[PDB]
Design an enzyme around this catalytic site. Structure first.
Site, mmCIF file in Angstrom:
data_model
loop_
_atom_site.group_PDB
_atom_site.id
_atom_site.type_symbol
_atom_site.label_atom_id
_atom_site.label_comp_id
_atom_site.label_asym_id
_atom_site.label_seq_id
_atom_site.Cartn_x
_atom_site.Cartn_y
_atom_site.Cartn_z
ATOM 1 N N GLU A 28 0.845 -1.201 0.000
ATOM 2 C CA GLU A 28 0.000 0.000 0.000
ATOM 3 C C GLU A 28 0.870 1.236 0.000
ATOM 4 O O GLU A 28 0.631 2.198 -0.770
ATOM 5 C CB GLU A 28 -1.010 0.022 1.135
ATOM 6 C CG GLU A 28 -1.866 1.321 1.175
ATOM 7 C CD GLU A 28 -2.697 1.577 -0.066
ATOM 8 O OE1 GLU A 28 -3.040 2.764 -0.318
ATOM 9 O OE2 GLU A 28 -3.046 0.601 -0.757
ATOM 10 N N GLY A 88 -7.682 13.653 -1.486
ATOM 11 C CA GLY A 88 -7.875 14.121 -2.847
ATOM 12 C C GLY A 88 -7.511 13.102 -3.916
ATOM 13 O O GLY A 88 -7.450 13.468 -5.092
ATOM 14 N N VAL A 96 -6.318 1.334 -1.142
ATOM 15 C CA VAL A 96 -6.723 1.388 0.257
ATOM 16 C C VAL A 96 -6.489 2.687 1.113
ATOM 17 O O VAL A 96 -7.367 3.146 1.802
ATOM 18 C CB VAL A 96 -6.159 0.110 0.890
ATOM 19 C CG1 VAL A 96 -5.362 0.344 2.148
ATOM 20 C CG2 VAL A 96 -7.266 -0.877 1.133
#
Ligand code: RLI
Length: 195
Positions: A28, A88, A96
């Site tokens: 991630e 944003g 995730v």
């Protein structure tokens, strides 16, 4: 809802028992660095396994934003780190978010180079020790996240494995061949560079 992530971790990072979710934590963070090659001007990503079972990811992207976000009255960085999908970049019609990594980490260290300054913040289970703070001057831009995974969430296979990280970084290099990707293991000095 940092508790909400810790309540349902599988729904974000996968299996918390066989090592796969543990390593998805690293991926991630690396995916966020990779996104800056297109969204910013990231050209280099360094992934390091430290000897105390933490991993860091350093990029030379734009730096996570640091200015006070009006609704929350804290730094944008803190919002990105503590509020699911904040920042944003989430498109609810399109992964995730670093807030998931923070929620599931015993400790997280964040160091941002942006707008002429170095900024730092430390979290414990997703709770900041202090507001984001300026630590010095820099001309660089980028973000470094180092995290120590929570043993309340991750069980059984809890230690990071060099080869699992190298295999996924080798795939990511093939699909992002303009980005220099380095993997370094402080335990033994092993390193690999891609491409
Ligand atoms: C450790 C590796 C890592 O996560 N790097 C990351 N770099 C960035 C830049 C990350 C990130 C997550 S949401 C977000 N929003 C913005 C929004 C606007 C700007 C800008 O106007 O300039 C920059 C970032 N930026 S996350």
């Amino acid at each position: 809802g940092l508790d909400a992530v810790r309540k349902r971790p599988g729904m974000y990072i996968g299996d918390t028992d066989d090592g796969t979710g543990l390593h998805h934590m690293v991926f991630e963070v690396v995916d966020n660095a990779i996104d800056e090659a297109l969204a910013g001007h990231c050209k280099e990503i360094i992934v390091t396994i430290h000897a105390d079972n933490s991993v860091s990811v350093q990029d030379d992207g734009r730096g996570i934003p640091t200015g006070i976000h009006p609704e929350e009255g804290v730094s944008a960085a803190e919002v990105i780190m503590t509020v699911l999908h904040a920042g944003g970049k989430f498109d609810d019609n399109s992964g995730v978010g670093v807030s998931v990594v923070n929620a599931l980490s015993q400790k997280l260290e964040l160091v941002i180079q942006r707008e002429g300054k170095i900024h730092r913040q430390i979290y414990e289970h997703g709770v900041p020790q202090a507001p984001l703070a300026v630590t010095g001057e820099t001309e660089k831009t980028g973000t470094m996240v180092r995290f120590w995974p929570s043993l309340e969430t991750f069980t059984n296979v809890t230690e990071f494995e060099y080869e699992i990280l190298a295999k996924r970084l080798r795939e990511l290099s093939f699909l992002n061949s303009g980005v220099s990707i380095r993997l370094r293991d402080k335990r033994d000095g092993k390193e690999d560079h891609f491409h």
